[model samples]
Target: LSSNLWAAVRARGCQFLGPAMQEEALKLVLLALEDGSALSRKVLVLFVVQRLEPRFPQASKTSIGHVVQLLYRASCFKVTKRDEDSSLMQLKEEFRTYEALRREHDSQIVQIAMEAGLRIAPDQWSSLLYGDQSHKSHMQSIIDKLQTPA
Candidate 1:
């Protein structure tokens, strides 16, 4: 049985594992991110998003779930939480890939900055406490500041 490649295994070809097993197998994916070193990280990234991206919501259906999994596994939107030197290097070099995520994701931070209202918690990261449209226009002005002659 395909069993979604062990994400849902079947003892008798029709009996596949349930959501619980899906959770377990996705954790195995986490193990790959955290521990597997033989394969290159970009290849790992491609394999994951290419294939198992299909498996993402099948295991759990939530935006934060997928974002958190990808963010924790390969992206660096939240740097303070994870400190695993072992797997950290697995994703450290995908600079351009991450900044793209940063562009869209930092917008989330902008929303959270106001939605949280000092509860969420700075420096540049903390600076988006302003509202959304203003926040966007603010970005334009920052570049304008850069463009200004010294």
Candidate 2:
């Protein structure tokens, strides 16, 4: 499915996973972000954060917190070098643009998390809290600072 279609599916909530499906839909969305298509990456990043407030409300605070970090790393990687050609510079420029956009979205997601009173899970919280850093501390310091009161 195209990332956009997957986003609609995500909008349907965990129901897309079927009522009995034990799998977390958010994880699937995150996995989809790795797709090579720009649309896929864009939709994946957008939907993941958008869906957080609803489908996994309890997890939203922590999950969105971590997603902010993922967004940052994704932004950095999306702008980095890969195979280059005469036209490759254009791709690099596009990546830079995506990085900026993703950073903006990341900030929004973190704000949503804060509004929900969810602190980003600490590294040690992985085992005791979420049991995994992927959805816990994916961006490390970003969430760490979020957990601390200003």
Candidate 3:
């Protein structure tokens, strides 16, 4: 009903929340990622990776699938200059998570994780390192894939 609309608006509002309350917002969205509509889930994920990089304070106990989405969707996932709190370091700190995730039995998770690790920061691209500007659409295409049937 109207509350769904309210929630959608609130979800958008979560994008710019102050860090203090934003942690709570992330937790709420984490839950939503599990049960919300697939399209909404993808939109919220875009918001998190795009805007909440430095403030992703969730515990490592998050579902592997959700964690997988967070990693690959992140703009700075492979960038060396990322913030400590960004998924780059968080996932790197617990990188074995992706190892088990990428190894042995598998689904789309393995490929996604392997893909996440393969991407390097711009430095390796030489002069193009400064601002190739392609990273945004690259992420956009990934996000678009999420719109598919979940």
Candidate 4:
């Protein structure tokens, strides 16, 4: 079977792995993030976010920084030329969600997300956060909040 097929099989089987096995399974999923096919990477990301993170929060916490880095790297991967594919769309959405989550709590993750967004889709980044209006002021608001003592 192809890499995509193997990834799908691993994702499906991941749910059945015992606690001991889950760690190993997570490793495979993480490794698969570098897969050439967007579909495979997408499936693996969903598995990591939905399944592995919840079930193994400690491990997830330890690996999350790395995962975020990988996702940012993968964001640059080429997708379809005609229209955006579902996988790429979901990946972008995941980044947005992650950024929103970190905006209030973790400055570091927020910075990573911001940098990733600017790198991945510079044109869309402003509108993505502040609609079509004056995004500079909105971005300033974010900067102010980040600067404020917590």
Candidate 5:
């Protein structure tokens, strides 16, 4: 049936619309990532960060800087790895790549969070300090705020 036909059926004002289908949502995310446009990628990363917010509340607050890192790591998992020694050994490189990406992304997210005044969660503290730019800002802010003349 066409969109018109579907619209006509719904015109009857039936309250039972059944369950919502997420097929389009999944496809959109996949397409956004695969399109290779920096803008699209940025949007996709932001979308993912937003989706992960509920599961990791401090995600936006404490881990905003690292959000990019997490997405990069997640993307690495979505890719194939190569190595001659063994499957596990080859995969190690991919893991390392993911780790680096995670660290970077986390840093960006934390920067965004600091600018936005969100609460960072304790559990995500490690990511916040994991070499992201925030390490400096966080440290500086603490020192600036805590400095007192005795």
Candidate 6:
């Protein structure tokens, strides 16, 4: 009934669906990723990363790799030169944040995050070490806090 609503609203609304409906909710969100609007696609990614995955980690584990692939594909989406507000940039930022979290203590979550990060952003090692400009400050801060002093 709210087909005309914005994707962000729709994405947030899905959170109220609860764990019982997670499978169907995730399927719907994944399908929405194919929408022509990059904003919608980005919102879908954020929903899974910020909401679904954390809320349903076990149920969502097997699908994380697929989600990463979609995120990688979304990162390649181009916007008009002046469209500095492009959602693709946000998607990339989210991906970087997700990858940075992978560097935390090892666990099943860390393993999946590492695999996804490496698959989606193959150059992540350099970015993690030197820090990409867009993620420089944030990445550097995380690295400094997590690294042990020699």
Q: Write the per-residue lDDT of candidate 5 for residues 1-150, one digit (tens) a residue.
A: 123322332333211111121222233334444433233234554664566555445434223323233344334334333465221101124333433433333344444444444545433443334323335544444434334644
Cα misplacement distance, residue 110 of candidate 5 (Å): 1.0
Candidate 3 TM-score to native: 0.19
Per-residue lDDT of candidate 2, residues 1-150 (tens digit)? 223332432332211222111134334443443343333334443555555545555444334434434344334334324455211111123333433433333344444445445454345433322344553444454465556666
Ranked by TM-score, the better of candidates 2 and 4 is 2
RMSD of 5: 18.2
In candidate 1, position 132 carries an lDDT of 27
- The window of 10 residues in a row where model 2 has the poorest summed lDDT is 13-22
TM-score versus the correct structure, for each prediction: 0.23, 0.28, 0.19, 0.25, 0.23, 0.24
Model 5 bad stretches (over 4 Å): 1-96, 124-150
lDDT of 4 by residue, 2-61 (tens): 233223323322222232333344354434433433444445555555555555655443
The candidate, 3 or 5, that scores higher on TM-score is 5
Q: What is the lDDT of residue 68 in candidate 3?
A: 36
Q: Residue 49 of candidate 6: its Cα lDDT?
A: 52
Candidate 3 regions with alpha-carbon error over 4 angstroms:
1-15, 35-37, 41-150
Please, what is the whole-model Cα lDDT of each candidate in the order they appear? 0.35, 0.38, 0.33, 0.39, 0.36, 0.36
Q: For residue 73, what is the lDDT in candidate 3?
A: 45
Worst 10 residues of 4 by lDDT: 9-18
Model 6 earns a TM-score of: 0.24
lDDT of 1 by residue, 15-132 (tens): 1123333334334434454442333333344444444445555433232244344334334322323445323223333332433334433443333334333222223332332222
**Which scores better on TM-score, 4 or 5?**
4
Q: Number of clashing residue pairs in every model?
A: 0, 1, 0, 0, 13, 0
lDDT of 6 by residue, 1-150 (tens): 112221222232222222233334435443443343344344555655555544566435234334344333333233333345533423233223323323331122213333334221323423432333354454344444534765
Pairs that clash in candidate 3: none
